[PDB]
């Protein structure tokens, strides 16, 4: 019921019944893949790409039409970033928080938030390590965090 | 987290029975759960039950007969060494005569009597009396 806050909501995407294609909504799988690749090249993250596909074009999910997801496709092509997207975002957030703290020494809530973010990042990092995406003996923290980010 | 899905289901069923409902809706719907339900049916504690295919995990509906009294689930799946079975039964079930202690084992998910007949016990799941 949420990781960090005490807010237990279900703001959530439903997903339709048919694993098979929504008949009429046409195009091609290959075309979709190409589009995704292009997006990746441009700079759009997998989620972003998916959103784009949903909004203007007739795509519902890549999982449906291609068979494969988006991240997987990117990997196959050679386009998934070194740091996975969510993790990267988290890191960025942490960095921002750190910066804010530096700017304004006296700020307790902010500090707490930063700490929380860091913890989250650590968790994520650990998970990644367990999986085998990010190589082991590697902490994504604070001083080098900035460097990692940019 | 949703720990012991089966346990949750059992609890729900119990609640329904207490209420005086004629039927229950169960969310997760496992293999183990299904087995348990089947066992219950065999014994004579439950009507029809139907697995909905949420193109996903599962979702069961059970027809309650008004015969169930408790449909319990023991917590960690304790390792039962055949002689201990009797003890377990004594602890849980009312009367030497009737009721069952649904325990998984090598052979399958079965009641205590069945296990005895087989000559094969294992880890407990629940009970029905």
């Amino acid at each position: 019921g949420r990781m960090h806050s005490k807010g237990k909501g279900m703001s959530s995407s439903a997903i339709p019944y048919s694993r098979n294609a929504p008949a009429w909504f046409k195009g091609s799988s290959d075309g979709v893949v190409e589009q995704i690749i292009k997006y990746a090249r441009k700079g759009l993250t997998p989620s972003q790409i998916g959103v784009l596909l949903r909004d203007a074009h007739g795509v519902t999910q890549a999982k449906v039409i291609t068979g494969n997801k988006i991240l997987r496709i990117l990997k196959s092509n050679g386009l998934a970033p070194e740091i996975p997207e969510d993790l990267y975002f988290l890191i960025k957030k942490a960095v921002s928080v750190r910066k804010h703290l530096e700017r304004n020494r006296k700020d307790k809530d902010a500090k707490f938030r930063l700490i929380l973010i860091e913890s989250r990042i650590h968790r994520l990092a650990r998970y990644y390590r367990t999986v085998s995406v990010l190589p082991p003996n590697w902490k994504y923290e604070s001083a080098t965090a900035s460097a990692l980010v940019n | 987290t949703r720990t012991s899905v089966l346990a949750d289901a059992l609890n729900a069923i119990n609640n329904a029975e207490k209420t005086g409902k004629r039927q229950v809706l169960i969310r997760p719907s496992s293999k183990v759960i299904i087995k348990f339900l089947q066992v219950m049916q065999k014994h004579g504690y439950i009507g029809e039950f139907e697995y909905i295919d949420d193109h996903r995990s599962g979702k069961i509906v059970v027809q309650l007969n008004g015969r169930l009294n408790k449909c319990g689930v023991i917590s960690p799946r304790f390792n039962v060494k055949i002689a201990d079975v009797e003890k377990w039964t004594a602890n849980l079930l009312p009367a030497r005569q009737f009721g069952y202690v649904i325990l998984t084992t090598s052979a399958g998910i079965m009641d205590h009597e069945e296990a005895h007949r087989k000559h094969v016990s294992g880890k407990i799941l629940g009970f029905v009396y």
């Binding site: - | 049916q41 029809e48 139907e50 697995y51 909905i52 295919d53």
Partner: protein
């Protein structure tokens, strides 16, 4: 093209099917072309309980897509050709079984090939360009699994009369008793 577009061709029924296909091709706008990129792995015959009969014609699987891209018209043609019998362009699926604890690792199975999965795939195939909304499965008091298929109310013109036959076919394939249903 008699004993050619059939992967391995021994039987009379298969030959007949081939002949029919050839005849169909005789037309030749795109149908012929489609036929040229289509074959059968084998054919299997199911006796439906009530006069009619069912033809589970097995397809490789890579050609399944091609069949689908045509299918309905082709199916209709086949029906016209061979009276008193329904046709199902079914897929020949493998079913590499579950390995035991002691048994040998055949470099793992795919979950595409798992028995249940295979069955599901077959079901999907067999019911036409119509699409399943969902499935109930009823476990009855005696102890009989009865699958109950909810069909999507759009179209439902091809399936309408074939439901029993389809069920029979499914039973033959698997053993499970299927039933069909349509919501309002």
């Amino acid at each position: 093209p008699q004993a050619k577009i059939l992967s391995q061709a021994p039987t009379e029924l298969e030959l007949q099917v081939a002949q029919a296909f050839i005849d169909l091709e005789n037309n030749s706008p795109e149908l012929k072309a489609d036929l040229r990129a289509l074959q059968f792995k084998s054919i299997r015959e199911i006796e439906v309980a009530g006069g009619k009969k069912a033809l589970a014609v097995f397809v490789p699987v890579p050609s399944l897509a091609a069949y689908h891209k045509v299918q309905i018209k082709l199916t209709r043609e086949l029906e016209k050709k061979f009276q008193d019998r329904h046709v199902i362009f079914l897929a020949e699926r493998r079913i590499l079984p579950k390995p035991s604890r002691k048994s040998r690792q055949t470099q793992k199975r795919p979950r595409s090939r798992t028995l249940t999965a295979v069955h599901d795939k077959i079901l999907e195939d067999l019911v036409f360009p119509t699409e399943i909304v969902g499935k109930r499965v009823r476990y009855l008091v005696g102890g009989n699994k009865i699958q109950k298929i909810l069909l999507n109310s759009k179209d439902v013109q091809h399936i309408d009369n074939k439901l029993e036959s389809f069920q029979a076919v499914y039973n033959k394939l698997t053993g499970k008793q299927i039933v069909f249903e349509i919501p309002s």
